[PDB]
Amino acid sequence: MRLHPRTEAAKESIFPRMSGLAQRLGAVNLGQGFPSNPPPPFLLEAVRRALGRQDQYAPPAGLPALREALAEEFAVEPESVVVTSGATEALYVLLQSLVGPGDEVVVLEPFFDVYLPDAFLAGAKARLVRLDLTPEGFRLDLSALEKALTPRTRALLLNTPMNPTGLVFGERELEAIARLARAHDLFLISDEVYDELYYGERPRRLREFAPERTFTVGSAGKRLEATGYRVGWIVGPKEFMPRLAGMRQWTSFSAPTPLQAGVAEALKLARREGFYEALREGYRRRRDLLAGGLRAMGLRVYVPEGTYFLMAELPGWDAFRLVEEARVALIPASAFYLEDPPKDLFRFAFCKTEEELHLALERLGRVV
Amino acid sequence: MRLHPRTEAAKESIFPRMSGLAQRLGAVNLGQGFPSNPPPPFLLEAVRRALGRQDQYAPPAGLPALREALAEEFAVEPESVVVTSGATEALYVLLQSLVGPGDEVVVLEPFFDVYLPDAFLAGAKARLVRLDLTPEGFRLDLSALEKALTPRTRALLLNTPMNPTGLVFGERELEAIARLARAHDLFLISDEVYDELYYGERPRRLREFAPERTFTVGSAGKRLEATGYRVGWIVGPKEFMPRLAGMRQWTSFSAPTPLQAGVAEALKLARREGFYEALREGYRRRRDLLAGGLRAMGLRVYVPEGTYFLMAELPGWDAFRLVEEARVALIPASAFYLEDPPKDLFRFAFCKTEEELHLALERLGRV
């Protein structure tokens, strides 16, 4: 007896592994992305209110109230919204529903942890388009993007705000991508879990340029500082949504009911109490704190436009040596690149307390 | 542009569909199985204490406290327990991990909604083995089981206490199954979400006769009257567990943290406070209530030994036809069989209040 060859993709992710390593070593954890603080009180109270009354199965597509709350934010009808058990499931069910053997999916490099494994589990082939890393920062070359499209290309997987670059795609880029999508009749998968976490002008969404072929992915955990609630969603053309709900039905059936209920109220309260605005400000403050502290050490730092991650170069170091000698956990570039990753490039998560960030700067400082 | 052909399986499930229909028609819902009452106080309290403390990502394999609480109940180490987002995910990840193109999987019929679609999405073929429906009740034909085995069979999927039959596999039968699996070197997938809901003698587990090849599946939702919490588990040989944690990692990454934390404490309290016994006692009454009630109407009724489901025959009746005229929702046998399903057979769910049951009997009575 033996497991199916498919399970070769079932390797423990470097993200939770680093987290365990960090707890064991007593190191400041600036690797895997999850807030050090608890979620806002209005969300906790909304969930408490749901416990005891909404504990049983919810429809696969989602609790009616959550679908309506999301529909209002996205200006679509409830039937074009499907609630999944985290954006993680949304992404898995989408690749599973859009590509298969013989199909190709374009993925930008550096990429998010689940893209390639999901592509592989769908039996599809992924074609990577590495973004250019200049002294100014990461930059997308649309020529290189177009040069990657082929007769078998069925979908394009985009992520903005982008993890780990912190890049936010501008109007001209989305327009250009929407244009290529239409010209080759491609499906557009847009991972926008950090859609409310940007530091500049509010970005425009890819779905505005190509609504008939775009699937927008969101996450309550990345919206409301509650990564462990496992509530996410897909907003896309309604004609395809019933199928997607059909697919997530077999993976986990439905998302946690009381959490879906609490999030529904929370999404509305957040919009009217200026929560996202205050959150962005709290994060910008910490982004600058980290960036400035690393600059002062004489390090090369690429200031992000979104998400709570930033990348920097620490010459002559490797993640594991750092976590043990400096007692600071970071995620190495090799985690986001398939082959030949940039030398000495690390990702920092700054969704931590200011104290934790200062502690990390002090420790990295001594070990220069 | 069109969706990949694999989406053929993405058909809306009849169970939540009938619940939506029962709600619109103001009908008593005895179809999809989910309690009318809320979960026990000690579970609600445990979740409340976790809110604000344990809200971020838990490890894919599960929160240490839950894995350990589960390991204690099963008399195994934590490394052989993996926490899934409901038993539904356990089943999907399992088939995705054990079978693929060219492999076959044996499934007993009547089956649970999730079995065939999961087999199909893994790229394997499912060979069905129908149980015999006698005047007494359902029964497995060990000969028929063995007959269905081929050189391509990689696993067998059992469900006990069985849904929808309410059948509880006896000691002798589990042993026979254990030998066949061992002889043919097959994997055994045992769906035991209703392992604490039985009405007779404490049932034995399949993993006791073949611990080396058995993966046992459980559900906090079916153990603790909280179906919407989405916390399930897989208990199996440690040699394979890391790979299973690796697979669910890509499907939903990890189960809801505060719910896991709450379930961890609740599982321990349940044992100590005799929650399961009281639960069995409460479901037995309701079982006998619905059963006797349908008898008074002179209907054919098969009493279950487990689960909160029971099957009966309603001559010349259609499910949707019934939900409109009688305003009582049930699930037709067509949902549990692939072809030529028994005539006039429906599944009833008695995990409702006595009120709802009596109401369902009345409306049914005048029909």
Ligand SMILES: *Cc1c(COP(=O)(O)O)cnc(C)c1O
């Ligand atoms: C965190 C994250 C996800 C997954 O979100 P969940 O809701 O936690 O499953 C998906 N994509 C990106 C880019 C993320 O940062």
Ligand SMILES: *Cc1c(COP(=O)(O)O)cnc(C)c1O
């Ligand atoms: C309810 C049920 C499941 C699914 O359990 P979840 O924990 O709700 O996902 C699986 N198998 C059987 C036989 C069930 O009755």
Ligand SMILES: O=C(O)CCc1ccccc1
């Ligand atoms: O750290 C991350 O980039 C975000 C959290 C995460 C990591 C890996 C899988 C799912 C989510």
Ligand SMILES: O=C(O)CCc1ccccc1
């Ligand atoms: O009613 C059922 O038998 C149990 C609940 C269920 C049904 C279908 C898919 C997942 C769960």
